């Protein structure tokens, strides 16, 4: 079943392309489609209510990791659901594109790894208990 690393790279590659960037510039590294589409819908819902994530973030190379973990820990503090996992991908995507915009491209491959490891260590058990990524595809369509 699904390599989380692969998922992260696919999602981030997509979100970077939406900002005119190529994944290969910064990195030498049905589920994928559902996640891309869900990310687009999530971001539409987000900007209907709030400001684009890329506008809200305050990034520095020295605090990027700490910033990433604080956001993700609060996002999942009182539980996990598929919508929050989509939020997690969208946040990582926003963090990457903003990193590039702010001339901190070094962070792109790091953020992808932070995401992959958080998925593998902290979200994967829940994903398994909820039927795997196939469940997400069937729910989203």
């Amino acid at each position: 079943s699904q390599s989380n690393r692969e998922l992260v790279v696919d999602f981030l590659s997509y979100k970077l392309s939406q900002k005119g960037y190529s994944w290969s510039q910064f990195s030498d590294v049905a589920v994928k489609q559902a996640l891309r589409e869900a990310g687009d819908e999530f971001e539409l819902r987000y900007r209907r209510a709030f400001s684009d994530l890329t506008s809200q973030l305050h990034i520095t190379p020295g605090t990027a990791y700490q910033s990433f973990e604080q956001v993700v820990n609060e996002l999942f503090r009182d539980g996990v659901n598929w919508g929050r996992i989509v939020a997690f991908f969208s946040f990582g995507g926003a963090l990457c594109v903003e990193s590039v915009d702010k001339e901190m491209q070094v962070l792109v491959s790091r953020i992808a790894a932070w995401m992959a490891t958080y998925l593998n260590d902290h979200l994967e058990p829940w994903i398994q208990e909820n039927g795997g990524w196939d469940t997400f595809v069937e729910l989203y369509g």
Partner: peptide, 21 residues
């Protein structure tokens, strides 16, 4: 703003989740 961002992500996440539940 980390906590603020996470709270907004969570709210839209839960809205998203409820729609496709």
């Amino acid at each position: 703003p980390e906590i603020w961002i996470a709270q907004e992500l969570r709210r839209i996440g839960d809205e998203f989740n409820a729609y496709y539940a």
